[PDB]
Symmetry: D2
Subunit: 392 residues, 4 copies
């Protein structure tokens, strides 16, 4: 048995929109995570022979964001780099491609992760090139058009499909708000008891003339529990889904180093976990909130696991309904799901979350001395991915 | 021996900038190529387990360009999609990931390729979000900023690094122009003798009320051979590199279907070729024009091939100097390199070219009844990929 | 009796939107008209004491459009310039201010007119200064927002108020189309018989390497008489007003030189006509189409004229209904109104038209050896101006 | 003797750029001044038969800014309105045209003034209409391109010509800074002793959820005397002209009511002053800082006044050098010039300053019981205007 193992895993703090990382581009967040992941793996700067970083909103970053992040991290010029867009799942699909590249023998040491600066997403002029001709046009938010809106039902925010899911499942405004308060409570607790310290690499940001250490997640401490049940529906007249039971716009990155178990052992490197499998599921774009259920069932078949044998689940909290659908359809305890909080408290930097939730899962498995984790993420366009990890 | 085989391979015609496909988005070009590749593989809508499409300039396309192209082609909603940016090498890296996804056992049937509408890249406003405050600002061409300029020597076009290479190698104005004239001549002759017909899927384009059948490459017929020795240098005062010994901006797509030989045999599907290996190479961003030399040398080590056993080479003609460096440092006859012409005649739709040259290579190997091909592409950021294919 | 006299009067041809003058800015059109007006008055560069030019859409032209046009014409730097916006009436209000500046003794020789490049009006970003923050925004056509739409019923085009007037007056689709056909016929015939030749200054336009002489009105020759009864309503579901019984977007300029009769006699300069009076009228913005009725009635009170003593009328054809309201409420024969055609055939370069119709009126009075003319123009914001001219 | 008299005069406070009036458009500032001027003249809402308002930066305001201001003030629909651009002199040229319109008998009661929202000037896309085609372009600050930059030496700020004037006149950095400190001191004093109270109409601005009374000039209290001599030259390497010895960007409006003395007497209205003359001067655009000297000498000839007979001068402080040139060339005491401060302390809302300085001059003549004032303003494009007022 020579499975692929994760030997290192780290994330930046997750900043709020126009918050802590307002003036930090995606490649600098990526560089911070990449540097840390390689130092934690006890590797030299030239030992990564495949690097794949998730990123959805690449407009205005310049050529090859992942290349900018890897070279900005101090890794050697010889490091092959790719930038990967599988929407909200980009950071996990990076792990899955890196995993397969290692199994196929194309690489011996791979860096996977993702990064997003939602703050630095620019505006777009679709008809600047060839001409508006006459009449008003649109100045398009890149984050909205290329990140948050469906491509088929044009202009339709993903929150509308989360509302369809609330209606189909009978998820009440109150039950969504309770899931969101549990996520917010857990994150504040985790932060307070230092349960994120082992997984975070701080950044230094230039603060006008001075410099600040950002070493903690910006959003859980700023949340107002009192306003949650007061908010207007966000996506539909007289709906249940709100800003507070949806994930927020966020800036962050995450990076993990993978290799064969035999290569970790040949390096004297203690693995965090073996990857025991991964799964890809797709259906209609308007059914994305339930897609994680499909991915996790395919993952149980591919691994030979059962749901009952899994200690911890991370299901990315794009909306409370995504977590609540998974609890209903996979018969999971809220006690085993998103135990340190989730995107409803921490944010959803779209290209990083798929990797971020795997970093959080690894830390949490270690902290409670548990064996088996599953991470799953729903994906714009109607997809989900899921990954099984096991501590040895 | 159960190698991964390419069972189908197709491209759109390559259009000129604001030409034949000015009104066709990237996902429509990708959809045309994906649809024909699936048809030529005799597959039904739900038989592609994994789709990866290269695309560099994703801004303004909406969520998940590869998902739009796959569903636009008529493939089922169950088809997992990813959009890949490895700059000029995107289309080849797509083949490489699909290849390793099959070998890893993560899929039975994969689709790879790339697509680029440089015509529909939008303009960006980097400071529209938080304000320009006062004084003029930039409206940034996404194609220039995110596709054509170096990220490190900010604003420097890749043609300046091509001029560095012309200086380092002593490639004269005349020798580069002769390479470009052989590329245009070969392409014009390939067109006239029908040597592109087997590899091209025509598109129907709607010119207002009229409809037009685009079934041939736009650029070779419009080439002014007489003007080539008369152009000014394009990148450097007193230089050698011009618009005619550089590739042009181009719109296009290409797609290929891969599977184990044993799966192709089970389906009664005659393979075009076995993939015998692939290699990635990276060095300093400003040395990109010679990166293919590293990629091809690394490819001979991994495959166990030698240069002399290769029948045909495709080296993407980002600039004539890229081909000429490869001919000198790999000791290749011009007669075995880019034998139907290359990007200097056809164009360089950046996210598609790394797959497009594999399509052209496979058809050329078939026409001359040859066994062994190498395709290599240089890449913004200082990289290159190469792939080895063998007809059985 | 020492009345103010018009000694010269000239216009550019009127171009179609993005047509003949697509590449000519407003100040170049103004410069052509100013230069010929000064030449026809036999004046030298330093003999104009006051210049006022109408122009509505000044955005993106740089400082002081009228100053650019005056100096561009070759007039001396000593020439005081002002740019005037009274919407569709700018060109006439320029004549009115110049007229009163002479009578007041503030000048001996004044130049008035107007100029408009609707082709070169730019697009605006209303929130580029302080930021769009998040979500789509508007890129605003300066021509629409600042020229064509009501400021009070925000976004409402002036053609909706034209439809109100068609309803209030019972002007049928057929009757409006007949007015427009008489306007196109008269213009086409005026063109063919040379009846515009004395009033037009040709421009030389540079089409890349080629040069072209534009010496005739672009729009009347391109008019499809057959399509007029077939167009849809343009402003209201089930309405009567269309693109063909409305004026078109147009590029053009006009200029006139004024002075006391005694100054014209001192210079040996034969006047074209005496100004006998001018009137301003305003009412509710949504009644603009009938404002000329008020302006002309107020003009007969101030001059002591009656309608029956007037030989020719020019009422600017912003819409056919503007002419038809004037014909009904002023009891005017169609045979005495807009006898060489009007804006329905020629176009409506908004800042120029109020001066352009005076130029056409003066030439028409000369050709038919008639004495007395009235020009009137309706104005966005609910206004109108009219002027009385008499040949001696 | 029946001269034109000013019966009323008022201004808004002058806001700083993105300051007090950040969210107040030009027509609302105009409306406040217009309303007050008409109430102070003891006129009904329908008694103004000519309204001319200066405004340079009309982009994005909608149709007919002056019409929006007049109707927003509550004046009757019957009030004729024009928007006037004579750059920095717009507000005084409005007074001069209104004056001549009254003398010519075209109107009996005229409203003149100007208004500018420099904060609400938008950005422009010159090639949005017909296309950028390829390569970066500019997003143009309307305020910079159409307000502050020369049109002939393209991109050249007016501060560069003020530096040429410093060099030609030997105006030292220290002498400029001293003029600026005197202007700042005088304004703070004037404000402190309520010497602006009689001339200002407050506005109420909505302050998030609340509402603020803005009744005082924003800029003099915020100025830092200590930083003045520390600032870097603003316009030329190792120059003398700075941000603090130049006027600042400002938001404000001013309005004055004019009529014949016989009409003020027939209404029982006490005039503030008779207008005894006006003058217009123009020369090269790069000599604008000295143009006021030309205007004031022509004004002395036209009025039959001499410089020695004038009690107070207002010369608009576009730059300290403008004030200092006038002191040198007209042999004027700083004691008689800009006695309550000037644009170096208060700001330069470009389309209003020409009227603003006349309001300040009238108040100051009353406060010191003096007879004769001169106001003069330099004008982009190389012009100046000047007006003589006399208390009776």
């Amino acid at each position: 048995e020579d499975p692929i193992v994760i030997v290192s895993a780290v994330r930046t703090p997750m900043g709020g929109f126009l918050g802590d990382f307002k003036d930090v581009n995606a490649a600098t967040l990526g560089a911070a995570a990449v540097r840390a992941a390689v130092e934690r793996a006890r590797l030299q700067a030239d030992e990564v022979d495949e690097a794949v970083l998730g990123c959805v909103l690449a407009a205005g970053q310049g050529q090859a964001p992942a290349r900018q992040a890897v070279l900005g991290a101090g890794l050697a010029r010889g490091t092959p780099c790719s930038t990967l867009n599988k929407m909200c799942g980009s950071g996990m699909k990076a792990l899955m491609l890196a995993h397969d590249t290692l199994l196929a023998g194309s690489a011996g040491v791979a860096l996977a992760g993702g990064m997003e600066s939602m703050s630095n997403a620019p505006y777009l002029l679709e008809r600047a090139r060839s001409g508006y001709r006459m009449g008003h046009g649109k100045v398009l938010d890149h984050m909205f058009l290329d990140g948050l809106e469906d491509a088929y039902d044009k202009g339709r925010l993903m929150g509308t499909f989360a509302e369809d899911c609330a209606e189909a499942y009978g998820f009440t405004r109150e039950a969504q708000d309770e899931f969101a308060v549990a996520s917010l409570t857990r994150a504040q607790q985790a932060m307070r008891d230092g349960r994120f310290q082992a997984e975070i690499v701080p950044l230094t940001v230039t603060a006008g003339k001075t410099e600040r250490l950002v070493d903690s997640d910006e959003q859980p401490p700023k949340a107002r529990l009192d306003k949650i049940p007061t908010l207007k529906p966000a996506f539909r007249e007289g709906g249940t889904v709100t800003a507070a039971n949806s994930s927020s716009i966020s800036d962050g990155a995450a990076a993990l180093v993978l290799m064969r178990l035999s290569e970790a052992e040949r390096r004297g490197l203690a693995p965090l976990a073996a990857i025991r499998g991964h799964a890809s599921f797709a259906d209609a774009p308007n059914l994305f909130p339930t897609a994680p259920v499909g991915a996790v069932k395919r993952l149980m078949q591919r691994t030979g696991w059962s749901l009952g044998e899994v200690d911890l689940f991370e299901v990315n909290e794009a909306f409370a309904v995504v977590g609540m659908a998974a609890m209903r359809d996979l018969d999971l305890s809220h006690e085993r799901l998103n135990v340190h909080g989730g995107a409803c408290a921490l944010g959803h930097p779209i290209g990083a979350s798929g990797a971020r939730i795997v970093v959080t899962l690894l830390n949490a498995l270690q902290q409670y001395d548990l064996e088996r984790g599953v991470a799953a993420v729903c994906i714009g366009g109607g997809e989900a991915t899921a990954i099984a990890v096991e501590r040895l």
